[model samples]
Target: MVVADTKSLKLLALADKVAKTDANVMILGPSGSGKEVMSRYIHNASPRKEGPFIAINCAAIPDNMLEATLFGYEKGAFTGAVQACPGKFEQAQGGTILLDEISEMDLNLQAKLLRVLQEREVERLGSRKSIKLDVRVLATSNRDLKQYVQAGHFREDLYYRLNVFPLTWPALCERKDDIEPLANHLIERHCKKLGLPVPSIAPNAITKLLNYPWPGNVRELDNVVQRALILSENGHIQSEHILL
Candidate 1:
């Protein structure tokens, strides 16, 4: 939620406005562009702020396991099913669920997701009865989902269903105004994390940051700052301390 850039400020305004309702939000952006952070911001500002916020990274899950992860399997449903458990959607009841890196989800699982979104209920594997579901949905994808739909990699119906509100996060290079403030914030955070005293970054070091292209965005910046912190001493970061 760093807001030094005009582009970031505009996005924040839209996210806050969209947060007032339960409408599903689809955040589109490049990898490491802070889409997940934006989703959490929306959840905190919404009426459901008092409820839970559950996140599942679709790209990180295997196709064979996603079904059981999203729709809990009953105890002994399979060889490895030792005990029954509530899946993400059920655990997210009365709150929010974030489908991160959704573009990578398998097509078959996408169909199941569409049905859950449409039915507002879920039937756990090996269970005869269905559980009623009520929760806000937020999703993020680093890819163009419309293109994914045309390529038959994603479901058009699910895309339309979840894309009630769209917000795009600008890449760091596009919002260079945020670099200075964001660097400062990251510095303080990393310092606290290392149990070290907070240090000041030299103006010349900032000059280097503002001039270079951040092709990897905020995630890259954090890495660069961490490297600089490692090389710096006497609580000061100078021009040479900034690598790349």
Candidate 2:
């Protein structure tokens, strides 16, 4: 929904088109460029909006336990398997599942994920039964996965499977026009949480904001706005109150 620039407008249009189908989507963007937010928008636009929207950061989870985390495990499947646990796939049934940072997943787990996509089912650990899945899958990456495939860090077939409908998010620097609006939005929300009136951005502060290159993108912008709001005492965010 952050379509303030030409590039972002086109990306949102494509996301709207892709939301009508169950096709797997791959969201490509730099870190903090709102890839996950784009995925959530797609899910909300789709028919599965009412269903659960589960997200798992592939890079944050350990490789050895990721398989079990995605496909569940039966009782006694492992050392601490005193009870059965349902994985992300089952939790996302009849909804959408976002595999964030897909490039960080181990090659071995990528094979199992590929199979899950191809078969539309998942088998739990230490169990032969395959449970049917009706979930829409979306993946986000901060790197060019095709390059990773070339480097032998990712599987080529899995890359193809996930690249069905690729959407690239525009970085903050690419949409300077959106910075003020986004800052305003973040300021309003954060001020409400802090029980303070929403403050206005001074012209000087706005100039400073637009001139800087936001390498960390929207996430960083949000952090900066929050800090500015806290520093403002007379209900105006001056340039002196702005940090970075």
Candidate 3:
């Protein structure tokens, strides 16, 4: 059985503290450092759990819809904007909004975002009136926001606004001790999901799982374990089945 360690204790405490406050939190970390998951954890533990927890990936959204996606737009604001729509911020009113990959937001959008942070309101596209939003902002950036602002890719004001309650996530590689138990947990959980009998990991497979550089982190480890379970005919988790 896996037990929570001091590091996990720290994680739980951090999440607990942030869960009570309505302050905006910025989660900074390397890729696969569980930023998104941590953000959700905070939201779920917060009072907003009964409300909506809207998440938007600034990096993944198309450039054109990026502004409208966050601030919403009225009908005829753009070529194809046939109806007025509520953006993530509007949808998250009285709740929380998690902007993942926040550093990837375009420069123009960054300025508009600064306005919303300053005023707690947003002016939809092609509209003069502003709509007040009671959204608790939680943002995650895998990149260095300060450096990005210095390099002219991100706005300094926006960085300052979003960095209110900064929390840094430790990379999976940095927490090597947690790997084996985490892997075991994932394996068992996955098997439960697949409705298959959970098998024991051969002694050597644990070492292989620990040594491999999980570039994709927990998500990658999950996929690896899932594939192994599907291919093993003898219902045993072997080292050869778990590879980088």
Which wins on TM-score, candidate 2 or candidate 3?
2
TM-score of every prediction relative to native: 0.91, 0.91, 0.87
**Residue 83 error, candidate 3, Å:** 1.9
How much lDDT does candidate 2 score? 0.84
Worst window of 10 by summed lDDT in candidate 2: 234-243
What tens digits encode model 1's per-residue C-alpha lDDT throughout 23-51?
A: 99999989887788899999999999999
lDDT per residue for candidate 2 within 133-168, as digits (tens), equals: 999999999999989999999999999999989887
Task: Report the C-alpha displacement of residue 101, candidate 2, in angstroms.
Answer: 0.6
- lDDT tens per residue, model 3, 59-152: 8887468888898899999999999988888999888999988887889888899899889999889899999889989998988888998999
Better of 1 and 3 by TM-score: 1
